[PDB]
Symmetry: D2
């Protein structure tokens, strides 16, 4: 009944989320800029565990070394005063006009080198602040037209960039891992490594694959009409879910970044069920934007809503899995059989097993119902709190 979050829940927010001023492609900002220090304080009061940042969220682009030092000290004091942590950091390689054709895969070589130096500089800061994960979102890596980018060459440049970052981390002896955040499009017509699958495949071609994982975002996969929980399951199966971005999205359209729980509610339920049952111990990070219709009270209400929805869904998913009637239904649908090896007896045994082919009664097997609808209605009843 009580859905109050505590820092033990590991809820985190990016500074750019509650700090989003409301500027969109067709309108000016509707809210004044927030001082990172005020955000840290406000979030701590709501029950958050920590915050994340892009280098440029914390230190205005173009800042001198002294100003940079000042901005960091103020922030550090706010963390000390609240007990807030900084589990992840990332680089802004998308806002400045110089990154109009990308950062790591920009056609101009000088821009690619600059991108790497800007990233490395923030990796040092991230480590200093205690971050365990460093996220990379290649928002500008891609194209609007076919001849503008040779994708094979671009992937060589992307691999070269990540390999160099791995070499840097290893040489400095840092205890930090990278997580690639996929997105299919926006702001580029098509973005490279568009989904969790493409990102996972790419990671296997890096020199030190063990240092890289993925940071999937619910809305991003939904922008390609994909099943988010399924994508997360594949990431977990590969042992690559290093971090996760939680939010809401209503189908295939622009990236809405609604508060978590909004958008596809049932997908949110299945996501929470999976994370909790798989024992994901990383942060529950919200990358969302409080709609521009809201004033400051609305941004804090929206932020609180992210955490509340996760906690309600967690309760309902747990009740679902603990319900004896559901456990019975899972057996009726043969989920237990799905977990048993198809042929632990081996290939030869399988080939010699007449019950597997020559004497297999296909019609009898075909007539068995899967009982998935009853199981799904039990899930619906639990989600809606209408069990009886």
């Amino acid at each position: 009944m009580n859905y109050q979050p505590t820092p033990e829940d590991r809820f985190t927010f990016g500074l750019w989320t509650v700090g989003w001023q409301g500027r969109d492609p067709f309108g000016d900002a509707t809210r004044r800029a927030l001082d990172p220090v005020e955000s840290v304080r406000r979030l701590a009061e709501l029950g958050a565990h920590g915050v994340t940042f892009h280098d440029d969220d914390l230190i205005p682009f173009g800042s001198s070394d002294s100003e940079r030092e000042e901005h960091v000290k103020r922030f550090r004091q706010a963390l000390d005063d609240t007990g807030m942590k900084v589990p992840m950091a990332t680089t802004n390689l998308f806002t400045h006009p110089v990154f109009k054709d990308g950062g790591f895969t920009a056609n101009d070589r000088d821009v690619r080198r600059y991108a790497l130096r800007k990233t490395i500089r923030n990796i040092d800061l991230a480590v200093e602040l205690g971050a365990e994960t460093y996220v990379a979102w290649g928002g500008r890596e891609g194209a609007e037209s076919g001849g503008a980018k040779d994708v094979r060459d671009a992937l060589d440049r992307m691999k070269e960039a990540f390999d160099l970052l791995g070499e840097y981390v290893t040489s400095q002896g840092y205890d930090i891992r990278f997580a690639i955040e996929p997105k299919p499009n926006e702001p580029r017509g098509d973005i490279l490594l568009p989904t969790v699958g493409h990102a996972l495949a790419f990671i296997e071609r890096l020199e030190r694959p063990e240092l890289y994982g993925v940071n999937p975002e619910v809305g991003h996969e939904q922008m390609a009409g994909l099943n988010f929980p399924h994508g997360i399951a594949q990431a977990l199966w590969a042992g690559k879910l290093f971090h996760i971005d939680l939010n809401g999205q209503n189908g295939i359209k622009y990236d809405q970044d609604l508060r978590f729980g909004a958008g596809d509610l049932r997908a949110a339920f299945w996501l929470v069920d999976l994370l909790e049952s798989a024992g994901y111990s990383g942060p529950r990070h919200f990358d969302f934007k409080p709609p521009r219709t809201e004033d400051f009270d609305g941004v804090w209400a929206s932020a609180a809503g992210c955490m509340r929805n996760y906690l309600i869904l967690k309760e309902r998913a747990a009740a679902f899995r603990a319900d004896p009637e559901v456990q019975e239904a899972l057996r009726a649908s043969r989920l237990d059989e799905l977990a048993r090896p198809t042929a632990a007896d081996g290939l030869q045994a399988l080939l010699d097993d007449r019950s597997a082919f020559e004497e297999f009664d296909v019609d009898a097997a075909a007539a068995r119902g899967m009982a998935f609808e009853r199981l799904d209605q039990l899930a619906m009843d639990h989600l809606l709190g209408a069990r009886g």
Copy 2:
């Protein structure tokens, strides 16, 4: 000017394409069944190089060993009489009611074993006929609801299945490779390994990854709103493009399987440009369905159209790449720079290079236009044959 195909062009068609009777979710068949022998003859006359098949296209499900032998002999004679090849074969693990919850990942263990035996049986036949690639399309592997399938367990079963097939091939000393064909949905609500990326990632977790590649289909990736040429480039980059399915699709909706060239025409141009420039030497396979509005003359016109469109696009892509004005435009857009290493000088050299950060003039770099629009209009002019 002449766009006549010859077997040298490597165009192939599945028996199920020109043989599609026109039955859809809301209507009965509009065409009579075609005898595979007649299809082979008709295709040979059109200039095709070969045909492909699912076990059930060639041998009616439930056929006795004698009938099976008869069906194969007739087919073999047609191949001998025409000079047609069979470069690829696949298994039908989706039509029969027994596969309603899948083949390799069905919840019922007995069905999974049956699926493997049915596949192995057709692998032997494929080798006998000279096929070099064996395709697997897990059309029924997936779900309509969240609790019906634990994806981690399903992926274990999928890996187990492919590992066993690899062991079989290796033990028999066959010279055949596997290609996984992804599809995001339809006929299941969500299909496992939904895109080329997910398939590539999965392959890296198999015991013998070198035996597996992908068989992407233009319409399938477009069903998720993805850029097909980009996906193919990633597959080539990984050295995994073993085969390809060519067709047309108009956006995000049901799988239309229109003739190649129809649907997204510009994507078709960029695809051909990529395949030809990368030196893809595999078959140019068409997996399409002549619309049910057509009679038999219409199916052959549609089939001929697939090949004609590929040949026209090939001519235009070649003219584009050979045009000195385009080569100049590519340099203006720095495609040459994209192909040069970002830091062949090494990490330390990069960190010490003041021109890469401390003295980098971001504003000057930012002011350079990419000239992508002029380049894209040159591509448009070439596609439309309006160069001057």
Copy 3:
């Protein structure tokens, strides 16, 4: 707490829903055909109010007048024995190969005439059985290619068809109205009158517009990524919501026809809220397909689930609207102001009102938050039954 349906709830089902055999584009039927009489009985036991039918669901295509009479008598007796009603009927102008290019807009004139006669014949039967609404779903009206159909001519033929049906109804003195059911695509590449909006616009060009309305289906509008509740609101605003098809759909892809409640759950909540608050008194019709993974027990579980979900959502929507805290939030968000005329004072008064422009403080107005996030979280809490 009790969500048991009674015939008073007006829940109806098409014979083709629970009777769907499971045949899809890639597979054969998984269930045996149901006798309409058994369906009527089974539905009555579940608490349904009535059933609907296509002519061909009730009388096999090609039936002689005697067989036709027999099929109708049996059905009629089942209705009498159960108390079930038949509030709506429709024509199957999509299954038979003759309708491959359409019914009312087929290019062949003889087919268009046949389509009209087949429809008229079933209108007589519908009236005999007591149907008040006659639905028309032009599933085959459309095209896969641009030159195949001149849309202006096709719309002339569509208007001609509906005008003739109106003349027939009027001349016979029948008390029955028509409802056009839109769908954007599938089985045709693009279907004419693709959304509720296009259908409403078309109706205004008919000779007797008062006889025609719309029969929107949740999944159909969602196939175009549209907001279903918004579409229904426009239909109600125009006084054209004559009937409605309830089901579930997971985004933009093939038409899934999942049970109501599945798919976009929040959209389902807002739909129910709107129907109940607007006083829609027509039938709550379910046009869904129990997944082919199910046996007969599963189809009845799925059917029961449709009604259960509607009843749960009705309870939650009512609690939401009755909550004093929500009523306060609605005022905070100025929903009360939205309902007040912008300028009941008139045009001249508006032009002379300096507070509306010359002395309007745009900055003060701009600074007011809309408080939509708090309102939406109150809606979420009510839906999930987590109010406190």
Copy 4:
């Protein structure tokens, strides 16, 4: 062979198109602001016929009456010096924070009144400059959440707004018509009157429907996965195509506003074919955004490309329709029959016609192929300039 535009072609551009600075949701501007006077001159040199504007593009928001007068005089002189016309004008009711919840349908009544006064003020200016059409794009009319907007009330407010504008125009004796521009989403989660169909339906409920039409945009309808040429055909059929916005879009995602010709090339061909054959005499207006990767030379290249592509497509569509082999194919596909009335003989004659039902040979009719594939390949050959 020559594709040079002349003012006779009626090509127009909005000031906000070539003047777009490149600011998107994730990045700052990449180009400096253009002075409207320079845009008029540059466009005139390219062969454009005229320009269009939003009030705020021409007169900075908040300008005093004197500055306003100055800005208008400069603009007027540029028009006089070049011969450029201003056929359409519109209001910016989306950029300023005050319109965060809409203009005509904002929940706050004072904002709705302000919106009307701002619009009326620009209508006077539009008439002064000679504009014949006044466009309204309700970009902010809509919502991100269900309870934020009661759609029935919002439509009452929308009708009230348009009715008042009609009364104003009529009372002043202006010769100007309105055109509503639909868009399904972005910047709002869902926008009211999302498609051409919804807009057409709404127009029929206004007090003076004859004063209102639609201004469809290719990319907007494609954002809902709809067939643009089909939508335009419905608009023409109703006599409501008052203006049109030409651009390119690659499927269902954010609004790209690519140059015309880019995106769905075949849809562009069918659109041009329809406009030219139907005798649309209104302006060919381009509402596009030169990608932010471009410098100023790139924006002019992109603008020129819009016109070039329209002219090439016009040539190809005309050659297609004039080709005797195509005319023969159109008859083979019975397009001539589609244009003939289904039953000019009348209802009674139809009911008594035994050839229409009792003696209709459905099987013979069903066996006729439509020959749509050959027709479509002839269209493809013409588009690609590969006829022989």
